[PDB]
Design a protein around this ligand. Structure first.
Ligand SMILES: [Mg+2]
Ligand SMILES: [Mg+2]
Ligand SMILES: [Mg+2]
Ligand SMILES: [Mg+2]
Ligand SMILES: [Mg+2]
Ligand SMILES: [Mg+2]
Ligand SMILES: [Mg+2]
Ligand SMILES: [Mg+2]
Ligand SMILES: [Mg+2]
Ligand SMILES: [Mg+2]
Ligand SMILES: [Mg+2]
Ligand SMILES: [Mg+2]
Ligand SMILES: [Mg+2]
Ligand SMILES: [Mg+2]
Ligand SMILES: [Mg+2]
Ligand SMILES: [Mg+2]
Ligand SMILES: [Mg+2]
Ligand SMILES: [Mg+2]
Ligand SMILES: [Mg+2]
Ligand SMILES: [Mg+2]
Ligand SMILES: [Mg+2]
Ligand SMILES: [Mg+2]
Ligand SMILES: [Mg+2]
Ligand SMILES: [Mg+2]
Ligand SMILES: [Mg+2]
Ligand SMILES: [Mg+2]
Ligand SMILES: [Mg+2]
Ligand SMILES: [Mg+2]
Ligand SMILES: [Mg+2]
Ligand SMILES: [Mg+2]
Ligand SMILES: [Mg+2]
Ligand SMILES: [Mg+2]
Ligand SMILES: [Mg+2]
Ligand SMILES: [Mg+2]
Ligand SMILES: [Mg+2]
Ligand SMILES: [Mg+2]
Ligand SMILES: [Mg+2]
Ligand SMILES: [Mg+2]
Ligand SMILES: [Mg+2]
Ligand SMILES: [Mg+2]
Ligand SMILES: [Mg+2]
Ligand SMILES: [Mg+2]
Ligand SMILES: [Mg+2]
Ligand SMILES: [Mg+2]
Ligand SMILES: [Mg+2]
Ligand SMILES: [Mg+2]
Ligand SMILES: [Mg+2]
Ligand SMILES: [Mg+2]
Ligand SMILES: [Mg+2]
Ligand SMILES: [Mg+2]
Ligand SMILES: [Mg+2]
Ligand SMILES: [Mg+2]
Ligand SMILES: [Mg+2]
Ligand SMILES: [Mg+2]
Ligand SMILES: [Mg+2]
Ligand SMILES: [Mg+2]
Ligand SMILES: [Mg+2]
Ligand SMILES: [Mg+2]
Ligand SMILES: [Mg+2]
Ligand SMILES: [Mg+2]
Ligand SMILES: [Mg+2]
Ligand SMILES: [Mg+2]
Ligand SMILES: [Mg+2]
Ligand SMILES: [Mg+2]
Ligand SMILES: [Mg+2]
Ligand SMILES: [Mg+2]
Ligand SMILES: [Mg+2]
Ligand SMILES: [Mg+2]
Ligand SMILES: [Mg+2]
Ligand SMILES: [Mg+2]
Ligand SMILES: [Mg+2]
Ligand SMILES: [Mg+2]
Ligand SMILES: [Mg+2]
Ligand SMILES: [Mg+2]
Ligand SMILES: [Mg+2]
Ligand SMILES: [Mg+2]
Ligand SMILES: [Mg+2]
Ligand SMILES: [Mg+2]
Ligand SMILES: [Mg+2]
Ligand SMILES: [Mg+2]
Ligand SMILES: [Mg+2]
Ligand SMILES: [Mg+2]
Ligand SMILES: [Mg+2]
Ligand SMILES: [Mg+2]
Ligand SMILES: [Mg+2]
Ligand SMILES: [Mg+2]
Ligand SMILES: [Mg+2]
Ligand SMILES: [Mg+2]
Ligand SMILES: [Mg+2]
Ligand SMILES: [Mg+2]
Ligand SMILES: [Mg+2]
Ligand SMILES: [Mg+2]
Ligand SMILES: [Mg+2]
Ligand SMILES: [Mg+2]
Ligand SMILES: [Mg+2]
Lengths: 61, 77, 94, 44, 103
RNA sequence: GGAGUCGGCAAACAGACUUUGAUCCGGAGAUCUCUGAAUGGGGGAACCCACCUAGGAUAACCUAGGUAUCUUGUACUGAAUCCAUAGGUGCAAGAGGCGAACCAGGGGAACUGAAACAUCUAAGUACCCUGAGGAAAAGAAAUCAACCGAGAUUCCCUUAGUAGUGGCGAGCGAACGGGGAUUAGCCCUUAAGCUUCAUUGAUUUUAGCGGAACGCUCUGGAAAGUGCGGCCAUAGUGGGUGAUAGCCCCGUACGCGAAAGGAUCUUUGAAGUGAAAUCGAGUAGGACGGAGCACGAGAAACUUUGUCUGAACAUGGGGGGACCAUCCUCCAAGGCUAAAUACUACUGACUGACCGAUAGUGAACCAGUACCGUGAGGGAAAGGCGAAAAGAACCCCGGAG
RNA sequence: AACCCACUCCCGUUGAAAAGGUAGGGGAUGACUUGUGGAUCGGAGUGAAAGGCUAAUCAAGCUCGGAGAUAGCUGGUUCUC
RNA sequence: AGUUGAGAAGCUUGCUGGAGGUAUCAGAAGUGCGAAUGCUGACAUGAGUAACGACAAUGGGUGUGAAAAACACCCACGCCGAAAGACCAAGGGUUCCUGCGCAACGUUAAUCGACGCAGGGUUAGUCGGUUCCUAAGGCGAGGCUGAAAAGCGUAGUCGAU
């Protein structure tokens, strides 16, 4: 997910990109607690994907 | 505090010299009293804490002219 | 509560022998929650995500242990724990 | 025997606390003097 | 730009392995390289059964300083120095002796 | 830019990222918890409790904004009291706190010296407090000289430890006149100059780019060293590479470079200010008590003012060290004004007949730390394997030490 | 008796303790004892008054500055001919 | 170690060490230590000497262990019992429980521990706070005073015991 295609969407389409990502992060926290998470890199990858969306969602205003 | 309202006179300092010339610190204070001034145009009295030198200036210039100067520098009375 | 806060109150389950026995004997599950989560929020997040019906939540704060090293005194974070009680028969999947 | 230091956390804060130094200007010179030295504590 | 790059054919100048040739495998920090096949060492590791199983004596290369090697020019069969030729659109490393690009 | 990267102590093991340009460096922006001037009200700093407006949820709320005080201006409003004054609300603009020093002011010691000690000194120092600026202050003669002249202020060297002053003790200490650094004046019949904008040009700063010339031989773990012979120079006593390198690497002389920010100096337009209106009256002068003038009442002039008084109007007024006459020289009681000058907490470059770990900063190391004290406050000790971890596989004694 | 106090002896004095202990001793419904919070301080406070107390410091606390005060007084002052 | 000068001192070599030193003549000094009840570290003598912290008190058996007077269990003795038992407040801050340990800490040993490492453990409409109210006292819009800092205080709002 790059910031080039994030500015191809509307504010309406950018507010379930965030809701989907937040749910995706939640599923990763649950796996990390129970020890059944081998994809360790996915934790930081989704953190920067949320912050990327919140920036684009603010450049609109 | 102890400052004349129309001239700004305040306490100053100096020395006491005896006959053997011992010097001790002292102060000189203004001779300032409370007085009510009848403002003819305003139809009322105005009370200030002026020294006796400020009473002579109000004689020379009037209370109309002295009050305007006080208003200019915001010295609320 | 906004739609963000649902996914941010629960920090995962807490694993211990006491929590293991509670989950079996009396249908009471133990979770790690955010340090500012209230009982009303915890109850709503579990109902919304895990599709179970929650009746009572009891919560406690846990102090961070202090471990002494060669560089001086250092301590771990303070966390918050919640006991969640469900209906007499239903479980909570992961 | 009774010794001179009898602890109490309420009275500690009301004589040497942060809000007790900031009240007076002589206590504000104490705080700025400890900041200049570089103290880690700076308050009781 | 770096005068010495990964997977380059170089020759060793100065040191115990002086005169040998090989390929560059890694370029570490603090100006050090790892040239394959030279500066070999032996490391003995105690095999603790806990946290996996370990072996005996391993074979590996040791790093050497970046100024102890030189690009091997396969035109005069000897070491040369490199330079960054003036760029039409991009820097190209060339041999000082022969003014030809490095490959 | 141009190949590696996921900060260090601090290593290992996993997950990964990328020549479809990563890590990294510089400009602009976005986010920016709680506390702290802390500013919605409280408070034991990092905590507790709210109200109003707009939108959204239906349950026990959410998101986004406002709510301190004071000063100035402005609109509305309105007591004793008829009018209106005090007061009360609502809007705008401004301040507040921190900082090592420099600056202008308000207050202001003592030890000490005098071989005791009061006048005197130390000293208008230490300290406390207030205000402004990158500098500040002062500045355009009611100034000096001496019958000849000079020409605003500030700083440096002399005159000179001189004339004075001084329980004439200890001590304090000028000016006139010369030599320099800087060069500038302009207004109250409204000006120079300074700010804030918008333009015309140039230069610098915040990152970077290229950057020349050595081989053989002997010892050695390892050549940069030995020996022989070369080359480069607007680059030859830099740093480090396995021992001592102009030619091995990073550099150095010398040239090139900025999407975008900052700053400086120039043009040329606008607005504000300078600004006090109209040449200066409770002012000059005087008496009493102090302070400053190098000058401690002394023949004691001059400035300043706590108390009390008090002129003239250019045929007039101030000064020329008591005072008088004559001469000379200036025009106070309204303003603005750059440079030469003072300082460095902070940033960069270079240098040292400076230190080399009991030294140099208290601190080369996770130091204003550990520790000591209720507190203010005081305050340490502690560097080095090796070129490279190649940091000792395996066997034996011993408690799986 | 609890509680508050400290009259005597011995021990201890490098102590178990920078003011104690064991035996006896005084008051024990009051001018009593005590917890919590608050007020007064350095030529100043407080004192049923001993110049006592004000953080194991008191004929004028502690701390940082003037400050390297001053010391006609003690001590010390480093290789050779 | 040898040698040379009248002396401060010089010179040559064996062993260690493993990278720097400075002739001669000049120039500059943080330029020479046994003393200052000197300052900082290290190490002696006293000396293997005093002491091992209430004079309630211990004796066997068994187990574990490299090792047991001291650890655990059993049988039997003693001591407190208006405490040497139990519980609140202050104060402290993980000392609480379990597994693994014994270098240092414990005035002896330690298999034990308030010691080392790692995990776990504290659940409230009714208990104590916060929230409501005030005492002593504090702060205090305006205000009154005061060289400046500031002092006092009204409306007000903090402050439990
Ligand atoms: Mg005096
Ligand atoms: Mg609770
Ligand atoms: Mg933490
Ligand atoms: Mg705030
Ligand atoms: Mg407040
Ligand atoms: Mg607030
Ligand atoms: Mg300010
Ligand atoms: Mg004065
Ligand atoms: Mg004196
Ligand atoms: Mg003298
Ligand atoms: Mg004397
Ligand atoms: Mg004397
Ligand atoms: Mg005397
Ligand atoms: Mg004096
Ligand atoms: Mg400024
Ligand atoms: Mg000026
Ligand atoms: Mg002059
Ligand atoms: Mg003339
Ligand atoms: Mg005289
Ligand atoms: Mg380059
Ligand atoms: Mg080069
Ligand atoms: Mg060496
Ligand atoms: Mg070199
Ligand atoms: Mg070479
Ligand atoms: Mg003006
Ligand atoms: Mg005039
Ligand atoms: Mg006038
Ligand atoms: Mg006069
Ligand atoms: Mg007079
Ligand atoms: Mg005089
Ligand atoms: Mg006079
Ligand atoms: Mg007069
Ligand atoms: Mg005059
Ligand atoms: Mg005269
Ligand atoms: Mg003028
Ligand atoms: Mg001026
Ligand atoms: Mg040191
Ligand atoms: Mg050393
Ligand atoms: Mg030190
Ligand atoms: Mg402490
Ligand atoms: Mg008692
Ligand atoms: Mg008594
Ligand atoms: Mg007695
Ligand atoms: Mg007695
Ligand atoms: Mg007896
Ligand atoms: Mg009795
Ligand atoms: Mg007794
Ligand atoms: Mg009786
Ligand atoms: Mg108190
Ligand atoms: Mg006090
Ligand atoms: Mg005193
Ligand atoms: Mg007596
Ligand atoms: Mg007394
Ligand atoms: Mg005492
Ligand atoms: Mg005294
Ligand atoms: Mg004092
Ligand atoms: Mg002395
Ligand atoms: Mg002195
Ligand atoms: Mg001597
Ligand atoms: Mg000697
Ligand atoms: Mg020798
Ligand atoms: Mg060297
Ligand atoms: Mg020399
Ligand atoms: Mg010396
Ligand atoms: Mg000696
Ligand atoms: Mg010695
Ligand atoms: Mg000596
Ligand atoms: Mg001697
Ligand atoms: Mg002694
Ligand atoms: Mg000595
Ligand atoms: Mg001995
Ligand atoms: Mg003996
Ligand atoms: Mg004996
Ligand atoms: Mg004995
Ligand atoms: Mg005994
Ligand atoms: Mg004993
Ligand atoms: Mg014992
Ligand atoms: Mg037994
Ligand atoms: Mg046994
Ligand atoms: Mg025993
Ligand atoms: Mg009994
Ligand atoms: Mg507690
Ligand atoms: Mg512990
Ligand atoms: Mg235990
Ligand atoms: Mg055990
Ligand atoms: Mg032991
Ligand atoms: Mg043993
Ligand atoms: Mg333990
Ligand atoms: Mg209340
Ligand atoms: Mg009250
Ligand atoms: Mg008050
Ligand atoms: Mg006020
Ligand atoms: Mg209240
Ligand atoms: Mg209350
Ligand atoms: Mg209560």
């Amino acid at each position: 997910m790059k910031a080039n295609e994030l500015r191809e969407k509307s504010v309406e389409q950018l507010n379930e990109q965030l809701l989907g990502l937040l749910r995706d992060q939640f599923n990763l926290r649950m796996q990390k607690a129970t020890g059944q998470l081998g994809q360790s890199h996915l934790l930081s990858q989704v953190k920067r994907d949320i912050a990327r969306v919140k920036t684009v969602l603010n450049q609109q205003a | 505090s102890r400052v004349c309202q129309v001239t700004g006179k305040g306490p100053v300092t100096g020395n006491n010299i005896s006959h053997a010339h011992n010097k001790t610190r002292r102060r000189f204070l203004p001779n300032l009293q409370h007085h009510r001034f009848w403002v003819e145009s305003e139809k009322r009295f105005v009370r200030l804490r002026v020294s006796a030198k400020g009473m002579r200036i109000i004689d020379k210039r009037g209370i109309e002219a002295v009050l305007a100067d006080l208003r200019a520098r915001g010295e609320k009375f | 509560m906004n739609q963000e806060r649902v996914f941010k109150v629960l920090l995962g389950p807490h694993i211990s022998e006491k929590a293991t026995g509670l989950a079996d004997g009396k249908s009471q599950f133990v979770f790690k929650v955010a340090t500012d989560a209230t009982k009303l929020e915890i109850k709503k997040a579990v109902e919304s995500l895990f599709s179970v019906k929650v009746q009572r939540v009891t919560t406690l704060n846990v102090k961070g242990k202090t471990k002494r090293t060669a560089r001086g005194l250092g301590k771990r974070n303070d966390w918050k724990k919640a006991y969640i009680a469900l209906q007499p028969g239903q479980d909570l999947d992961f | 025997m009774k010794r001179t230091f009898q602890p109490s956390t309420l009275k500690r804060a009301r004589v040497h606390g942060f809000r007790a130094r900031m009240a007076t200007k002589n206590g504000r010179q104490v705080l700025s003097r400890r900041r200049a030295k570089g103290r880690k504590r700076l308050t009781v | 730009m770096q005068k010495i790059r990964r997977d380059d054919e170089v020759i060793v100048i100065a040191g115990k392995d002086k005169g040998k040739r090989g390929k560059v495998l890694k370029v570490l920090a603090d100006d050090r390289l790892v040239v394959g096949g030279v500066n070999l060492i032996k490391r003995h590791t105690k095999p603790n059964p806990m946290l996996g199983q370990q072996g005996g004596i391993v074979e590996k290369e040791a790093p050497l300083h970046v100024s102890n090697v030189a690009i091997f020019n396969t035109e005069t069969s000897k070491a040369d120095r490199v330079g960054f030729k003036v760029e039409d659109g991009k820097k190209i490393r060339v041999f000082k002796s022969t003014q030809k690009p490095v490959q």
